[PDB]
Amino acid sequence: MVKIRLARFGSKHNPHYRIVVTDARRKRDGKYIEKIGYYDPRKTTPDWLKVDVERARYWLSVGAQPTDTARRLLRQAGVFRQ
Amino acid sequence: GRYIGPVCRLCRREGVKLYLKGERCYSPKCAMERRPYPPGQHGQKRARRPSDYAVRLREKQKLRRIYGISERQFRNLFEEASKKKGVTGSVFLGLLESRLDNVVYRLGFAVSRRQARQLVRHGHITVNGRRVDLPSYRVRPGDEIAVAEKSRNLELIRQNLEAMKGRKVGPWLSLDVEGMKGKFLRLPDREDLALPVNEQLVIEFYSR
Amino acid sequence: PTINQLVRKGREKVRKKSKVPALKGAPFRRGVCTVVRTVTPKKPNSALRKVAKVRLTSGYEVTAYIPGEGHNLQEHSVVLIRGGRVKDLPGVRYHIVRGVYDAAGVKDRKKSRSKYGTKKP
Amino acid sequence: NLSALKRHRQSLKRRLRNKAKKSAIKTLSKKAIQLAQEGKAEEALKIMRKAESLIDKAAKGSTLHKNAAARRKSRLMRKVRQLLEAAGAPLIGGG
Amino acid sequence: PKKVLTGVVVSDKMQKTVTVLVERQFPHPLYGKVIKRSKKYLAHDPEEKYKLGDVVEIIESRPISKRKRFRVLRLVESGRMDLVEKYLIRRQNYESLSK
RNA sequence: UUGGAGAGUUUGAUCCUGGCUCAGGGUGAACGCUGGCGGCGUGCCUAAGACAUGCAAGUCGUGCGGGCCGGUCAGCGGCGGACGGGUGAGUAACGCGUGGGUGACCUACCCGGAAGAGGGGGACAACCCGGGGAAACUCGGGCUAAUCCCCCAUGUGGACCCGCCCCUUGGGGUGUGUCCAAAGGGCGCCCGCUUCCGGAUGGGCCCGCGUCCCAUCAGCUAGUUGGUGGGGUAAUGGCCCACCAAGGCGACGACGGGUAGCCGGUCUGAGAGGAUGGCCGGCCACAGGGGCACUGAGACACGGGCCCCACUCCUACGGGAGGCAGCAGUUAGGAAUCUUCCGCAAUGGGCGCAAGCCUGACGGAGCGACGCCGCUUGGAGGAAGAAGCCCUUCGGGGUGUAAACUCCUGAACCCGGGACGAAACCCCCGACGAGGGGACUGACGGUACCGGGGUAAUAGCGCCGGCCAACUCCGUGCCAGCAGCCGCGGUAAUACGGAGGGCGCGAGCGUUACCCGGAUUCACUGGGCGUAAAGGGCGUGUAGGCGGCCUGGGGCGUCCCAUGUGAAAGACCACGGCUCAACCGUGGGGGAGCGUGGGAUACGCUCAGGCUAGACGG
Ligand code: SF4
Ligand SMILES: [Mg+2]
Ligand SMILES: [Mg+2]
Ligand SMILES: [Mg+2]
Ligand SMILES: [Mg+2]
Ligand SMILES: [Mg+2]
Ligand SMILES: [Mg+2]
Ligand SMILES: [Mg+2]
Ligand SMILES: [Mg+2]
Ligand SMILES: [Mg+2]
Ligand SMILES: [Mg+2]
Ligand SMILES: [Mg+2]
Ligand SMILES: [Mg+2]
Ligand SMILES: [Mg+2]
Ligand SMILES: [Mg+2]
Ligand SMILES: [Mg+2]
Ligand SMILES: [Mg+2]
Ligand SMILES: [Mg+2]
Ligand SMILES: [Mg+2]
Ligand SMILES: [Mg+2]
Ligand SMILES: [Mg+2]
Ligand SMILES: [Mg+2]
Ligand SMILES: [Mg+2]
Ligand SMILES: [Mg+2]
Ligand SMILES: [Mg+2]
Ligand SMILES: [Mg+2]
Ligand SMILES: [Mg+2]
Ligand SMILES: [Mg+2]
Ligand SMILES: [Mg+2]
Ligand SMILES: [Mg+2]
Ligand SMILES: [Mg+2]
Ligand SMILES: [Mg+2]
Ligand SMILES: [Mg+2]
Ligand SMILES: [Mg+2]
Ligand SMILES: [Mg+2]
Ligand SMILES: [Mg+2]
Ligand SMILES: [Mg+2]
Ligand SMILES: [Mg+2]
Ligand SMILES: [Mg+2]
Ligand SMILES: [Mg+2]
Ligand SMILES: [Mg+2]
Ligand SMILES: [Mg+2]
Ligand SMILES: [Mg+2]
Ligand SMILES: [Mg+2]
Ligand SMILES: [Mg+2]
Ligand SMILES: [Mg+2]
Ligand SMILES: [Mg+2]
Ligand SMILES: [Mg+2]
Ligand SMILES: [Mg+2]
Ligand SMILES: [Mg+2]
Ligand SMILES: [Mg+2]
Ligand SMILES: [Mg+2]
Ligand SMILES: [Mg+2]
Ligand SMILES: [Mg+2]
Ligand SMILES: [Mg+2]
Ligand SMILES: [Mg+2]
Ligand SMILES: [Mg+2]
Ligand SMILES: [Mg+2]
Ligand SMILES: [Mg+2]
Ligand SMILES: [Mg+2]
Ligand SMILES: [Mg+2]
Ligand SMILES: [Mg+2]
Ligand SMILES: [Mg+2]
Ligand SMILES: [Mg+2]
Ligand SMILES: [Mg+2]
Ligand SMILES: [Mg+2]
Ligand SMILES: [Mg+2]
Ligand SMILES: [Mg+2]
Ligand SMILES: [Mg+2]
Ligand SMILES: [Mg+2]
Ligand SMILES: [Mg+2]
Ligand SMILES: [Mg+2]
Ligand SMILES: [Mg+2]
Ligand SMILES: [Mg+2]
Ligand SMILES: [Mg+2]
Ligand SMILES: [Mg+2]
Ligand SMILES: [Mg+2]
Ligand SMILES: [Mg+2]
Numbered sequence A: 001m002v003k004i005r006l007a008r009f010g011s012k013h014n015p016h017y018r019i020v021v022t023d024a025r026r027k028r029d030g031k032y033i034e035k036i037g038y039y040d041p042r043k044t045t046p047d048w049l050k051v052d053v054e055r056a057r058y059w060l061s062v063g064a065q066p067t068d069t070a071r072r073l074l075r076q077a078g079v080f081r082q
Numbered sequence B: 001g002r003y004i005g006p007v008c009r010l011c012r013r014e015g016v017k018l019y020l021k022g023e024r025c026y027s028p029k030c031a032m033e034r035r036p037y038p039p040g041q042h043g044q045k046r047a048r049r050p051s052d053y054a055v056r057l058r059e060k061q062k063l064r065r066i067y068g069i070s071e072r073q074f075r076n077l078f079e080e081a082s083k084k085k086g087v088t089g090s091v092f093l094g095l096l097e098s099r100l101d102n103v104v105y106r107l108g109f110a111v112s113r114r115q116a117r118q119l120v121r122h123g124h125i126t127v128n129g130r131r132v133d134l135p136s137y138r139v140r141p142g143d144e145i146a147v148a149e150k151s152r153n154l155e156l157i158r159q160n161l162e163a164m165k166g167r168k169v170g171p172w173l174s175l176d177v178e179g180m181k182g183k184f185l186r187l188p189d190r191e192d193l194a195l196p197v198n199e200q201l202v203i204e205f206y207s208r
Numbered sequence C: 001p002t003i004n005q006l007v008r009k010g011r012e013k014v015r016k017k018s019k020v021p022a023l024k025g026a027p028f029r030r031g032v033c034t035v036v037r038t039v040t041p042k043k044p045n046s047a048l049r050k051v052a053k054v055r056l057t058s059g060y061e062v063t064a065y066i067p068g069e070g071h072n073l074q075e076h077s078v079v080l081i082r083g084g085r086v087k088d089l090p091g092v093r094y095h096i097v098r099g100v101y102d103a104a105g106v107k108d109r110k111k112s113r114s115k116y117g118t119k120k121p
Numbered sequence D: 001n002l003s004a005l006k007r008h009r010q011s012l013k014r015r016l017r018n019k020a021k022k023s024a025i026k027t028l029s030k031k032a033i034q035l036a037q038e039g040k041a042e043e044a045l046k047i048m049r050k051a052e053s054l055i056d057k058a059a060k061g062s063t064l065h066k067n068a069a070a071r072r073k074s075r076l077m078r079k080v081r082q083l084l085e086a087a088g089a090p091l092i093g094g095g
Numbered sequence E: 001p002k003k004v005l006t007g008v009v010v011s012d013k014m015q016k017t018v019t020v021l022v023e024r025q026f027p028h029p030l031y032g033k034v035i036k037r038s039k040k041y042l043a044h045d046p047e048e049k050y051k052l053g054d055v056v057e058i059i060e061s062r063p064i065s066k067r068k069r070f071r072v073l074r075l076v077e078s079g080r081m082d083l084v085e086k087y088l089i090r091r092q093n094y095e096s097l098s099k
Numbered sequence F: 001u002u003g004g005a006g007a008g009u010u011u012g013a014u015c016c017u018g019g020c021u022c023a024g025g026g027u028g029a030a031c032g033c034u035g036g037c038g039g040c041g042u043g044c045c046u047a048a049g050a051c052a053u054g055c056a057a058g059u060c061g062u063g064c065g066g067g068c069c070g071g072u073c074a075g076c077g078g079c080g081g082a083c084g085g086g087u088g089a090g091u092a093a094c095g096c097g098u099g100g101g102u103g104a105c106c107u108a109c110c111c112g113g114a115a116g117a118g119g120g121g122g123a124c125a126a127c128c129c130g131g132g133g134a135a136a137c138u139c140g141g142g143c144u145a146a147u148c149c150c151c152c153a154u155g156u157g158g159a160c161c162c163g164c165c166c167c168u169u170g171g172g173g174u175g176u177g178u179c180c181a182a183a184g185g186g187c188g189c190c191c192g193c194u195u196c197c198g199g200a201u202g203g204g205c206c207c208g209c210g211u212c213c214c215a216u217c218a219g220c221u222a223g224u225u226g227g228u229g230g231g232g233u234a235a236u237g238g239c240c241c242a243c244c245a246a247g248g249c250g251a252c253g254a255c256g257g258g259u260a261g262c263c264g265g266u267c268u269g270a271g272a273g274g275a276u277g278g279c280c281g282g283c284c285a286c287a288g289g290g291g292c293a294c295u296g297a298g299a300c301a302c303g304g305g306c307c308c309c310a311c312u313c314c315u316a317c318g319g320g321a322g323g324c325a326g327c328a329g330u331u332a333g334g335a336a337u338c339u340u341c342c343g344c345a346a347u348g349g350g351c352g353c354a355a356g357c358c359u360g361a362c363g364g365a366g367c368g369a370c371g372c373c374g375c376u377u378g379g380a381g382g383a384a385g386a387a388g389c390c391c392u393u394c395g396g397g398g399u400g401u402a403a404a405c406u407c408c409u410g411a412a413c414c415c416g417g418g419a420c421g422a423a424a425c426c427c428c429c430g431a432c433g434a435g436g437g438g439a440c441u442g443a444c445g446g447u448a449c450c451g452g453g454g455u456a457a458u459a460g461c462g463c464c465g466g467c468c469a470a471c472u473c474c475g476u477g478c479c480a481g482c483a484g485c486c487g488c489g490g491u492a493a494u495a496c497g498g499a500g501g502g503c504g505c506g507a508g509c510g511u512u513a514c515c516c517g518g519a520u521u522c523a524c525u526g527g528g529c530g531u532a533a534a535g536g537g538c539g540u541g542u543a544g545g546c547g548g549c550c551u552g553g554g555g556c557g558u559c560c561c562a563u564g565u566g567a568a569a570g571a572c573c574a575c576g577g578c579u580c581a582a583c584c585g586u587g588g589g590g591g592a593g594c595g596u597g598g599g600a601u602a603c604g605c606u607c608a609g610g611c612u613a614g615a616c617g618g
């Protein structure tokens, strides 16, 4: 099924994740349906986490299942906030 | 890494004084004031007419040996300057003048670019507080260059700043001898550098 | 030609020819010496040039020049050959590499030692 | 050395079940078409009803796809109606 | 949208099928001159209304057979035997090209 | 307007034409000499040759009955195994690219909505007993559970025939007739089950345009081309079959032969163009060589099955086992390409309510100057200038501030400290919701880094006749040898070998191979044909290419506007993180082509009406 997850970019010992929506059978660094956010786990920048809230809401509404880390990041960005 | 052999022979070959030694360059025993001909067995024979390629090569080698930079780094800097918007000769001269070792040589913390390289490499220089140990670091306008707080009580540094209390730095720089700290105001102008170099010759050399 | 003639026929590209076909696309080839001898050059040069007949791993059998003063090659010596013809010798298109397999380096060589395969003294 | 052996065993059992069901479907369809060709309309529709019920199941499972079952039913009903039209009067069911 | 082409009927020897000759122009990619090319399409003609010389429009459709993926949409004009004559003369000239 | 260099060589000398050669850049490189540190990338291009050994896909006891001592083992039953990983053999093709179509189609798990979940029956494993077999395994008798199988009922609904209506390729409604549902488990909920509609994702099929060389390959085709009926499929279709007609394709290059995975991109180039497709992302094909189907939502399935062939192994000779183009590794071939490493801590994936389990994907470490980037082998002072070596006009000149020598700093080393990457799932409250509180978890790694001590600490390679930067001595004597071209060498060689000196680069420097450039030397940009290579021996003429003046219509080419597409990465610009850089992150802009809607009509095209300067006739 469609999932909202993290695709790894960057370089060795320097991970930079993209929060993307894609089919679950695609390899993790392959082509995705669209891109909604980004994450820097090392937090080397003032803005180390961005999420498209409206697009994430849309994709959640149509049955996309986030991963644990993706769900945590979406909650930090305030996607599930009511 | 870099050239670590005899250095006055470079001046004698280029036919001009490249101040690559410091105090001895202004002394009467400067090798360009005693034997102003090229080194080797045939240095005192009448010179033949130099070809165009020879002229451009000698001008480029003079410019490169003034700053003591390898040819790979020199050419990379030249191509970078050619990519930038702005007159490529002036941009290239500014990029060369923004190297940390050259900047601390001009500020007066050293008497030669070689000594400035050893100062920067050995962890005696700080840029904006944090310590930098890389000669190739490129200083941007506004950056503060200074001697490390624990390096202020160093005899070589003390003498260097003593001998500069009278000398005045260029317009593109500011120095505080009491504060033991410099400031890089702007990119140096082409007229502010007393360089015996025609940069058009260097550009034409790299067009080949 | 007219534009219509160019549309009908076009311009023919130029096809280059290999000068080292026995190398079969490789930079070097290993071979075994069958005949070692000396040959005489064409006009105006005069010499006795040392060559070897080499049967290669690629299936061809060619003639290769032996550079440098003095050599230890003989029948059944294993050698490496590289491209490059010898101008004044007819039919010689390849050079033996000194210092590889059974071809020793040039003895007492002091200049240009990376060629001729001589170690630093 | 794996769990592929279990898959092969189960596949053989499912193959037996699917073959049995499809054979029964084919036999019933042929019987209904022949009876309609006789015409002989009363028993032809009863056999056709049996064939239709045996087509709709096991289209509930992996034996037949729904579209395949629909096509089977459509072809059978069309052939039966054509043959009975070539014959005389109709009977109950299947109309 | 479904592609619509315009052409002239050059063959109607098959049942319920017409051969339509479609022409297109394009500049040469490197030499720039505008050039003409033609292509034949087998088109479904169930009612057999269109005959030799008809200029018609055909539209991309569900496969009717092999080689038959277009349907005649409408008639554009009639009485165009000159285009057919050009095609037939070009075809006839091939007999003298052999060895 | 960011962008463009030429030289040597045909002559006694000259101009031109023209070939050859060179100076630049690049590579999955290789070979020679040399070799200190780190970061980031990258490493079988050949035999798609053959492979020892270990690992690379399992999981569920909250579906079920069991043997064994809360576990363990196997069995039945689900889901996964069609993804992920590898390779480039085949393929010149709707395979790929780009834009579209499907009233001709499928889609497990996920999400939303509607409705339902009633009753009855049964079998096969496991298991207990006999056999057969060397083994691999296999047969018979009997028992038994389920979310296993079957039947009946019910019909929110849906499937089929036949009508009817609208719509128009098989789309959507409606009427009689016929047919089709289901399963439980855990502590009132939760996880599950059945029918249908919708969404989202992922696919099948079809079409326009583009997609290499040879015409000394010119004709090809008989399921061939079309039609009718049928079979098969999720679905169109000669896909397959029976019958009827005689068609289909081709110089705009059919057919045949050779070669080749294709693209985003990459290298080169002033651009146009040329070459190329390693790594990374997308698609396709293949899994010892061939064929085939089964199961399944999905395969004709790399670590599933069957058969034939080659090969390897067991042997009681009847029979049986196997497939590294997964990760390492071996062997063969080759000029040439690595560890039988660590860990699931991160991200992703399968199963499971969960705990968790599995994951050679992946995150990391190792090896190789294979590439790029950064760094070190010291800094200052120091003789009209030691010794050695080389040259000399015998006065001297050079190596050379170079050395020695004094002062300074402090890579390696030592001691101590010490990471980020990891906050979730989990539990408590709240209502297992939203929202708050708490805890566990590090392979890399005692690594990066930080603080305090600390020694003067690798340099080599090519070249020095012209092109082309850098010259003298000795040795040899058409020999030895050098050579990219022109050419050097035959007793006074700046061209061979050595030495002193010099030039260029520098942990590298050269050489070979291949590609672009220079080559305006296939000339679209941007060449030519009297005598340099080049006008067909001459007519007539087919296809094709091109075409006079004026008026109107169309708006196909052409141009403009809006909109969709032109993925990500790469290229450009700006900002930012690693002490800089390489490298990486964020944002912005471009961009040929193609679809759609609108507009313009000068030119080309096309239709219509005129004119006589071209052409023809009297
Ligand atoms: S002393 Fe004179 S010759 Fe020597 S390096 Fe200084 S300026 Fe050059
Ligand atoms: Mg002309
Ligand atoms: Mg000679
Ligand atoms: Mg040398
Ligand atoms: Mg299982
Ligand atoms: Mg039967
Ligand atoms: Mg199925
Ligand atoms: Mg079916
Ligand atoms: Mg065409
Ligand atoms: Mg066309
Ligand atoms: Mg038809
Ligand atoms: Mg013939
Ligand atoms: Mg000559
Ligand atoms: Mg020339
Ligand atoms: Mg002549
Ligand atoms: Mg001459
Ligand atoms: Mg090497
Ligand atoms: Mg070492
Ligand atoms: Mg490394
Ligand atoms: Mg390979
Ligand atoms: Mg494992
Ligand atoms: Mg895969
Ligand atoms: Mg291939
Ligand atoms: Mg191939
Ligand atoms: Mg092939
Ligand atoms: Mg072919
Ligand atoms: Mg297409
Ligand atoms: Mg497309
Ligand atoms: Mg029973
Ligand atoms: Mg017994
Ligand atoms: Mg039994
Ligand atoms: Mg029994
Ligand atoms: Mg069931
Ligand atoms: Mg029923
Ligand atoms: Mg290509
Ligand atoms: Mg037939
Ligand atoms: Mg056929
Ligand atoms: Mg056909
Ligand atoms: Mg492209
Ligand atoms: Mg460019
Ligand atoms: Mg370009
Ligand atoms: Mg490829
Ligand atoms: Mg393929
Ligand atoms: Mg194969
Ligand atoms: Mg094999
Ligand atoms: Mg399934
Ligand atoms: Mg099936
Ligand atoms: Mg397959
Ligand atoms: Mg298989
Ligand atoms: Mg499999
Ligand atoms: Mg395998
Ligand atoms: Mg079978
Ligand atoms: Mg066999
Ligand atoms: Mg026996
Ligand atoms: Mg392997
Ligand atoms: Mg392979
Ligand atoms: Mg091998
Ligand atoms: Mg070899
Ligand atoms: Mg070998
Ligand atoms: Mg290699
Ligand atoms: Mg994991
Ligand atoms: Mg996980
Ligand atoms: Mg395992
Ligand atoms: Mg490693
Ligand atoms: Mg480097
Ligand atoms: Mg010194
Ligand atoms: Mg941490
Ligand atoms: Mg420590
Ligand atoms: Mg310290
Ligand atoms: Mg010179
Ligand atoms: Mg010579
Ligand atoms: Mg030499
Ligand atoms: Mg001599
Ligand atoms: Mg030379
Ligand atoms: Mg010499
Ligand atoms: Mg260039
Ligand atoms: Mg030229
Ligand atoms: Mg060209």
Ligand SMILES: [Mg+2]
Pocket: F520
């Ligand atoms: Mg040119």
Ligand SMILES: [Mg+2]
Pocket: F523
């Ligand atoms: Mg031209």
Ligand SMILES: [Mg+2]
Pocket: F527, F528
């Ligand atoms: Mg010419």
Ligand SMILES: [Mg+2]
Pocket: F529, F530
């Ligand atoms: Mg002429």
Ligand SMILES: [Mg+2]
Pocket: F530
């Ligand atoms: Mg002329």
Ligand SMILES: [Mg+2]
Pocket: none
């Ligand atoms: Mg003549």
Ligand SMILES: [Mg+2]
Pocket: F533
């Ligand atoms: Mg010519």
Ligand SMILES: [Mg+2]
Pocket: none
């Ligand atoms: Mg002539």
Ligand SMILES: [Mg+2]
Pocket: none
């Ligand atoms: Mg003539």
Ligand SMILES: [Mg+2]
Pocket: none
């Ligand atoms: Mg002639």
Ligand SMILES: [Mg+2]
Pocket: F537, F538
């Ligand atoms: Mg004549």
Ligand SMILES: [Mg+2]
Pocket: F541, F542
């Ligand atoms: Mg004619």
Ligand SMILES: [Mg+2]
Pocket: F541
């Ligand atoms: Mg004529």
Ligand SMILES: [Mg+2]
Pocket: none
């Ligand atoms: Mg003629």
Ligand SMILES: [Mg+2]
Pocket: none
């Ligand atoms: Mg004509």
Ligand SMILES: [Mg+2]
Pocket: F555, F556
């Ligand atoms: Mg138009």
